[PDB]
Amino acid sequence: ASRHGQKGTIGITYRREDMPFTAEGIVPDLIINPHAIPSRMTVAHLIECLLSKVAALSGNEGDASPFTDITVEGISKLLREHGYQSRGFEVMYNGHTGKKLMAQIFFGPTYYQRLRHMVDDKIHARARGPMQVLTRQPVEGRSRDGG
Amino acid sequence: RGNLMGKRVDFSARTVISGDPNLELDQVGVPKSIAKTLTYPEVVTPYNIDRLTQLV
Amino acid sequence: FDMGGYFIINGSEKVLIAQERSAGNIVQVFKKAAPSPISHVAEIRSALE
Amino acid sequence: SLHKMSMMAHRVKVIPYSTFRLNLSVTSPYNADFDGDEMNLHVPQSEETRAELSQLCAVPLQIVSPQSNKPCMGIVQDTLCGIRKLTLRDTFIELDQVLNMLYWVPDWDGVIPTPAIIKPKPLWSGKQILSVAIPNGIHLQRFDEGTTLLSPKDNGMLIIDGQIIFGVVEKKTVGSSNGGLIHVVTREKGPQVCAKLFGNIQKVVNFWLLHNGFSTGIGDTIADGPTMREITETIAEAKKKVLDVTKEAQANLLTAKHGMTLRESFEDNVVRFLNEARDKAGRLAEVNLKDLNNVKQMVMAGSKGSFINIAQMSACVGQQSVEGKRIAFGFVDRTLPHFSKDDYSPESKGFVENSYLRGLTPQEFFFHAMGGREGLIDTAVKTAETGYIQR
Amino acid sequence: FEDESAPITAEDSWAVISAFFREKGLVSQQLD
Amino acid sequence: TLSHLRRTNTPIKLAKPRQLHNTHWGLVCPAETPEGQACGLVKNL
Amino acid sequence: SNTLFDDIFQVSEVDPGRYNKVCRIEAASTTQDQCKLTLDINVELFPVAAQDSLTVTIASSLNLEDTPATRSWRPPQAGDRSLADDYDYVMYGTAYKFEEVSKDLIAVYYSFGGLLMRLEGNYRNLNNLKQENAYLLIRR
Amino acid sequence: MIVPVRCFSCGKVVGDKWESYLNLLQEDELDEGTALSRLGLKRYCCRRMILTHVDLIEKFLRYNPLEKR
Amino acid sequence: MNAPDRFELFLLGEGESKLKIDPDTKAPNAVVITFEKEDHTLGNLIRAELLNDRKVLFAAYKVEHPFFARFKLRIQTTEGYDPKDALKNACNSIINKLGALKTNFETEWNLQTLA
Amino acid sequence: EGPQVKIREASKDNVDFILSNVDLAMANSLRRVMIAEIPTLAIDSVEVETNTTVLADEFIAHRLGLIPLQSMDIEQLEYSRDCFCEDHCDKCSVVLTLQAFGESESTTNVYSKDLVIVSNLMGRNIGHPIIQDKEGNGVLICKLRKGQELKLTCVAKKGIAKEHAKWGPAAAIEFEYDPWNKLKHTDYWYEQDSAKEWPQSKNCEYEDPPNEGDPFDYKAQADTFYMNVESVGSIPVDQVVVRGIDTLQKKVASILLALTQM
Amino acid sequence: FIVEDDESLGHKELKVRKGHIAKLMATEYQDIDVEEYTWSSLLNEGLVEYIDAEEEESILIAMQPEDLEPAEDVDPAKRIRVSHHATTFTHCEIHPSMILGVAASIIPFPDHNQSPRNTYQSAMGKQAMGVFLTNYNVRMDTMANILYYPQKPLGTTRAMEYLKFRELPAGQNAIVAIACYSGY
RNA sequence: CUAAGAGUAC
Ligand SMILES: [Mg+2]
Ligand SMILES: [Zn+2]
Numbered sequence A: 001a002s003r004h005g006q007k008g009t010i011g012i013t014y015r016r017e018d019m020p021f022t023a024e025g026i027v028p029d030l031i032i033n034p035h036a037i038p039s040r041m042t043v044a045h046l047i048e049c050l051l052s053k054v055a056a057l058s059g060n061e062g063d064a065s066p067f068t069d070i071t072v073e074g075i076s077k078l079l080r081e082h083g084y085q086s087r088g089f090e091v092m093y094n095g096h097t098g099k100k101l102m103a104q105i106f107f108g109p110t111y112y113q114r115l116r117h118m119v120d121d122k123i124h125a126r127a128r129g130p131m132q133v134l135t136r137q138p139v140e141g142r143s144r145d146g147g
Numbered sequence B: 001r002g003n004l005m006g007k008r009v010d011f012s013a014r015t016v017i018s019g020d021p022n023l024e025l026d027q028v029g030v031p032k033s034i035a036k037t038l039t040y041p042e043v044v045t046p047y048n049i050d051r052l053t054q055l056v
Numbered sequence C: 001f002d003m004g005g006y007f008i009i010n011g012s013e014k015v016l017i018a019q020e021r022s023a024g025n026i027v028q029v030f031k032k033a034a035p036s037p038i039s040h041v042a043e044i045r046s047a048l049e
Numbered sequence D: 001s002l003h004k005m006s007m008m009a010h011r012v013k014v015i016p017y018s019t020f021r022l023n024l025s026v027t028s029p030y031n032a033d034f035d036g037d038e039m040n041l042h043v044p045q046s047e048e049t050r051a052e053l054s055q056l057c058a059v060p061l062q063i064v065s066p067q068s069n070k071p072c073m074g075i076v077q078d079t080l081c082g083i084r085k086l087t088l089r090d091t092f093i094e095l096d097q098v099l100n101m102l103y104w105v106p107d108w109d110g111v112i113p114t115p116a117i118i119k120p121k122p123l124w125s126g127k128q129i130l131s132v133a134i135p136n137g138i139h140l141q142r143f144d145e146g147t148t149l150l151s152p153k154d155n156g157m158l159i160i161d162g163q164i165i166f167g168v169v170e171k172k173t174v175g176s177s178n179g180g181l182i183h184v185v186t187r188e189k190g191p192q193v194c195a196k197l198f199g200n201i202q203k204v205v206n207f208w209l210l211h212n213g214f215s216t217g218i219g220d221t222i223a224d225g226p227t228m229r230e231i232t233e234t235i236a237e238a239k240k241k242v243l244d245v246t247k248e249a250q251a252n253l254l255t256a257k258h259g260m261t262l263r264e265s266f267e268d269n270v271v272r273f274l275n276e277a278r279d280k281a282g283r284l285a286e287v288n289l290k291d292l293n294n295v296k297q298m299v300m301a302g303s304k305g306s307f308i309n310i311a312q313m314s315a316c317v318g319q320q321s322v323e324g325k326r327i328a329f330g331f332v333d334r335t336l337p338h339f340s341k342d343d344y345s346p347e348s349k350g351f352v353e354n355s356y357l358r359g360l361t362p363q364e365f366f367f368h369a370m371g372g373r374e375g376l377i378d379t380a381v382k383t384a385e386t387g388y389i390q391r
Numbered sequence E: 001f002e003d004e005s006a007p008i009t010a011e012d013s014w015a016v017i018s019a020f021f022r023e024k025g026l027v028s029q030q031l032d
Numbered sequence F: 001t002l003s004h005l006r007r008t009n010t011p012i013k014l015a016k017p018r019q020l021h022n023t024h025w026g027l028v029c030p031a032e033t034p035e036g037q038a039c040g041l042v043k044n045l
Numbered sequence G: 001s002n003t004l005f006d007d008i009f010q011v012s013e014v015d016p017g018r019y020n021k022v023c024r025i026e027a028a029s030t031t032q033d034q035c036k037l038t039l040d041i042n043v044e045l046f047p048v049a050a051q052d053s054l055t056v057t058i059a060s061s062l063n064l065e066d067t068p069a070t071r072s073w074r075p076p077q078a079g080d081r082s083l084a085d086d087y088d089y090v091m092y093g094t095a096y097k098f099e100e101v102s103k104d105l106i107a108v109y110y111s112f113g114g115l116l117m118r119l120e121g122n123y124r125n126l127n128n129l130k131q132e133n134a135y136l137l138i139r140r
Numbered sequence H: 001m002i003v004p005v006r007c008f009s010c011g012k013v014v015g016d017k018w019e020s021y022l023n024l025l026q027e028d029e030l031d032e033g034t035a036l037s038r039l040g041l042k043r044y045c046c047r048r049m050i051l052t053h054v055d056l057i058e059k060f061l062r063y064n065p066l067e068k069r
Numbered sequence I: 001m002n003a004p005d006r007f008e009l010f011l012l013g014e015g016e017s018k019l020k021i022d023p024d025t026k027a028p029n030a031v032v033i034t035f036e037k038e039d040h041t042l043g044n045l046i047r048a049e050l051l052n053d054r055k056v057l058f059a060a061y062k063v064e065h066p067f068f069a070r071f072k073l074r075i076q077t078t079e080g081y082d083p084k085d086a087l088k089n090a091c092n093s094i095i096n097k098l099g100a101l102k103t104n105f106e107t108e109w110n111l112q113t114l115a
Numbered sequence J: 001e002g003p004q005v006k007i008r009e010a011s012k013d014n015v016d017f018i019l020s021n022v023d024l025a026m027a028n029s030l031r032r033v034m035i036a037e038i039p040t041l042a043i044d045s046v047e048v049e050t051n052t053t054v055l056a057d058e059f060i061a062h063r064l065g066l067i068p069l070q071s072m073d074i075e076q077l078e079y080s081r082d083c084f085c086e087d088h089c090d091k092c093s094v095v096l097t098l099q100a101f102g103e104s105e106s107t108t109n110v111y112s113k114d115l116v117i118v119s120n121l122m123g124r125n126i127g128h129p130i131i132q133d134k135e136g137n138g139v140l141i142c143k144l145r146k147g148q149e150l151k152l153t154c155v156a157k158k159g160i161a162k163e164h165a166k167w168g169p170a171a172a173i174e175f176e177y178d179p180w181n182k183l184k185h186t187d188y189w190y191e192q193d194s195a196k197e198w199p200q201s202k203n204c205e206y207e208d209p210p211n212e213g214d215p216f217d218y219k220a221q222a223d224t225f226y227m228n229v230e231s232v233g234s235i236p237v238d239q240v241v242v243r244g245i246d247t248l249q250k251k252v253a254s255i256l257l258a259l260t261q262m
Numbered sequence K: 001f002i003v004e005d006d007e008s009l010g011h012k013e014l015k016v017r018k019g020h021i022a023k024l025m026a027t028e029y030q031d032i033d034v035e036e037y038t039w040s041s042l043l044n045e046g047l048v049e050y051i052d053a054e055e056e057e058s059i060l061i062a063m064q065p066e067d068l069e070p071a072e073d074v075d076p077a078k079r080i081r082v083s084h085h086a087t088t089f090t091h092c093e094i095h096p097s098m099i100l101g102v103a104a105s106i107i108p109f110p111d112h113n114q115s116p117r118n119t120y121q122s123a124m125g126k127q128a129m130g131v132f133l134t135n136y137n138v139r140m141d142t143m144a145n146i147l148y149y150p151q152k153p154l155g156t157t158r159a160m161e162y163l164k165f166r167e168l169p170a171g172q173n174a175i176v177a178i179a180c181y182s183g184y
Numbered sequence L: 001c002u003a004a005g006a007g008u009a010c
């Protein structure tokens, strides 16, 4: 999950050669769906991605405090000075064919947390197993091979 | 309510779900470990003697 | 970096959650519902420390 | 599992990873996401149970729901957005990509359709390739607002014999809506053909969107300078009207609407003015957004988002309300200790004039937090009560 | 800066906050 | 750990304790509370 | 094979609309005073401006020989001869409506993969058009 | 914990530039951006690899060894 | 737990071959070739080199599922032209072009002095 | 005759060149092969004899696997899977040993220069950890407080980046074509003016800008790709490119051989 | 902060001035010889005050000093703020960002988000995996989870350097693309 | 094993 309530599980993993790449050879660590943005209105996610890109380029640290006078306009100007599109878009190329993607991709660093919920601690199946002594029904819980 | 209208059952699995645009509408992807755990009893018939013997 | 503020009971770290309550020695007046014969009630939960 | 569609029979496909995998279209009846949701699987243990599971609870047999006599599954999320982008008049596809997309359809009969443009360069249109997925013999005709037999706006929909004659394919056509393509196909050719149609449309549109790309960024929430100035002017005019109504009420010249008190009428007028102000500013911002705007594209396709989302992200978040009223005087006659007593101005009682792009002032941030808290509390109470009522 | 009695700026208040967190800490209420 | 060490619980009248009150400004976090049954009852300093 | 229709039109308007590669043009026949045309054209692939004279033809096939799509399209081999060799902009579409505008005027609607065309004129020369597939050939 | 051997995104070896980076920050009084540029980190993937690292191993080294030889 | 071994991406398993050809019944003179332990890197190249051929009516490929490293390639040629022959010609052309490119790059590199 | 190459810059670790008269598919396949398919040497197995450090055993094993190793003569090494030895031998592996002790009162840094090759390289040019910085110390494997010890033995096999990214010798590969967007393969997102808002690429100087009046060229294809290949250090960058081309050619040749044999 | 008449400037002003800030800075730098100046010194000299909800009913608070104390062409990108048109303040907020708690202080740009998203992140950051203590190697806890390479955020708040988040981070800076790449 | 409690996921 990001720091804006944008939780999600890994759908699939692609190796580097299959990921989309920019003209500089940079490939994303993560790809998230655009459709997560409009309904949830997590603008701070986008602003933080832009600020992180600027900070990584310039070597400073982005001041993402809430009620400061930091605007997307200034971050965009700083990003433009560094030689990138001011709004964070980058011309990417499809990994499979190497062709330019007709649409430009929002691209940049973002801080993500690994949450404690892993699938290997949740997967559980039971054909037959221990039965409860009273009701002669399957026991409860995956720690007990329950049903 | 707790043991007659609804009760814990065997031959059931549970886990996290993921999307797959490459699966049909009526298809479900099943982990190999779960498929190896859950079982179905097939009666031995002249029509399925060979494959059941192979599975055994 | 450990900040303390917890106890060690039988080797387990135990923290006391701050319990919220209504303050004492304060007069509070409340309107009652229509069916009840009393319309307003002014009460104090008197206590001495 | 609130309804019978939340429990359906699927066909096993053994896969080498530790999660259940399911089609994107079937997530709507299950009300399932992929943000940590878990699902349960039951294996029938006899030929009778197996057979009735396959013949009564199968997913294709559930496509049209008895709940509202309309399909419950449709095209959603990326594919939906993709299909809207694929069926535009501008979209043209070259020979190699056409061959790929045709081969991606499992039941394609093996004949390459004649390109829509033959000279000077063989080009296929998006509608032409998409019509390969639609089964042969399907007819559909929907007339949107203002569409004629010629479509200047390319809206509406005309499909003849399984070929899209005109209209941009979007939610009204391939969504879970009555009279749409899903409904027509399932009622004409049967559930199996409708499931196959789901698969074909998903495959082709997903391939095209893979090799076309779609994104969204911060720049998609930005309106140009003149539009921002007009939005500010609209907000200022609304605040002036609120101030005028406040002056009339303070002068006691305001007359109470029949059936309500003076204060109730004043609150109604103020809330109406602020709501229509937010609506007008959002409409200005939406009009300003270009057809290349990605949030606009997602709204137009209907895959995600709405006009209010655009208005709140770009123009104005709007009036925050708790229990259907403006923010109450939690302190003695004032909402916060940063305001004077008896301040009924829009900013005092929870009007957020800033958009999410601009950011919220501390007071607006707190008032928005109060609104969100009310939403969460309502969610919890609602789920408990509705569960009991449903039982 | 040079003037000792000059009014502070919004940037200066963080110094004050730092002093607070130097004397109090995060769990001051429990220990107190 | 830091959040746990600054947690307040309200045992559960005709009031509406789950709402974020105006008086909560600057004393408890405007947005930090469980989504479950404890929403609003469990607060953080 | 044979041209079901042919004429020369003058373009009075070109409307880009919301598109970047496609424009809708209204044209009036230079000979007949009652034949008019509305057509969507891939202007990127074939630029068109106002007051441009376009020779417009509708045919049932492109092969020079007479008629003896249901057959899979194939790339044009080197040395293939077709009617399209005589024109600059060729589309393939289907008729989907035959409207009776008036007692004498009829209109025929064609769709080339979503590019719409409406040809209106007296029925005495539009009679050859029927509900089928047709090639639209244009030369400047 | 300790500086990663390679950049996560592109795979450039950055595990041999931590000491040089600290030396540049301390001895030469360069700001972070110029030091990163001097070390040869031009893509911002590598720049975030080295710029955001937190060297926790130092703290781990303060505790006395459990098995001391 | 359920993750497959990474060497299954490029190592042929027991009892399977690199190529298998199945005649296609949808259209005449067409085949579908399944390539095992391969991915886009080979498929896109082969398909494009096939599309450069003048006697190839149809050429396409698809990777049906990312989980498995295999892809299907449909080839249809004009009458009297074996699709296997088309595949052979495409492969030979690719090898010739790569050899020429290797020679050119070696010659260009040898011309350098600052390396 | 064939694809033409003209290289702008050459270095020890970067080569910037232009690849003209070639298809887009061929350039992309070459890029993918360079990323993923080139064999390389890296530490695969770790036997830990003593670890009193503050880092976990598999933590250090992971770090060691990521150490770049000389792979110039990797073609003379065999894969462990198709070698007739039992676990590992001299024909398919290189054995290194790390032995560090904290004898100093200050922190002692365990670098990759401390790795010692124990197996007989038989005259090959593989195994040596790659040293790039001026100080001569390689990657910073670990740190030792006084009294702490770390003794371990690594076995390094040859592998490709597909099996694990630690075998990738390619780092980042810049790849661009058609800087002026004359092929119209992208639709530039913009607010007021696309040309002003999109900074020009450095390769725009190598092509003629569009005339702003000419009609769209619908027959032009994509060629003249500007590619910049970086090297991790395992093999020289020119060898990276040459071996990528060789690997792609070998793949196609294997396809031909299988087709002929069946 | 306490606000008084300050007749010298003729208008309300904070009791705290640059000299006290300088002394606090000097003490902090010495900790990282002058007379120690701590928070208790600010408290004793009547510079800051403790206010509870009951006393907060009878005061007026300025949100920020620089914009609300002094008596009254603007950047269109900045958010709209109101001067309140009132000069009778009794106190000033030390910093508005201090209304947030420990978990909410980690959110970057929390004022550019929908409030339920902030609540979700506040709940979900406690489940973030990082380094809970530096002595995890000598504690026999029932369960412990540690990142190999914790990274401090590229976008960071001022309040999170009192929470030691940069010293004990619970996440990583991943290169993220927002794209409909494969439908997965 | 049983019971009670707490935290948590959707
Ligand atoms: Mg969910
Ligand atoms: Zn990097």
Ligand SMILES: [Zn+2]
Binding pocket: J080, J083, J084, J085, J086, J087, J088, J089, J090, J091, J092, J093
């Ligand atoms: Zn061996």
